[PDB]
């Protein structure tokens, strides 16, 4: 499930952040509001962050 929306996601939009399919829209980081193209995923405490914003913040 997409823990941001609370909505179950499956193979169609299944982009696995934290071992679970998120919405590709929410396969993002909420810092910038940027959706990530399938990859570019970095998990931090259950929250998804862009590899770009990761390099900026961390």
Tell me the site size for Zn ion, rule CB under 5 A. Answer: 11
> Which pair of structure tokens corresponds to residue 53?
């914003």
Task: Please give the distance of CA 6 from its chain centroid, rounded to a whole number.
Answer: 13
41 touches Zn ion (CB under 5 A): no
Site string for Zn ion, 1-40 (x = CB under 5 A): -x-xx-----------------x--x--x-xx-x------
Site residues (CB under 5 A) for Zn ion? 2, 4-5, 23, 26, 29, 31-32, 34, 50, 53
């Amino acid at each position: 499930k997409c823990p941001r929306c609370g909505k179950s996601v499956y193979a169609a939009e299944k982009v696995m952040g934290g071992g679970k399919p998120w919405h590709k829209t929410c396969f993002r980081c909420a810092i910038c509001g940027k959706s990530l193209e399938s990859t570019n995923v970095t998990d931090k405490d259950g929250e998804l962050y862009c590899k770009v914003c990761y390099a900026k913040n961390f």
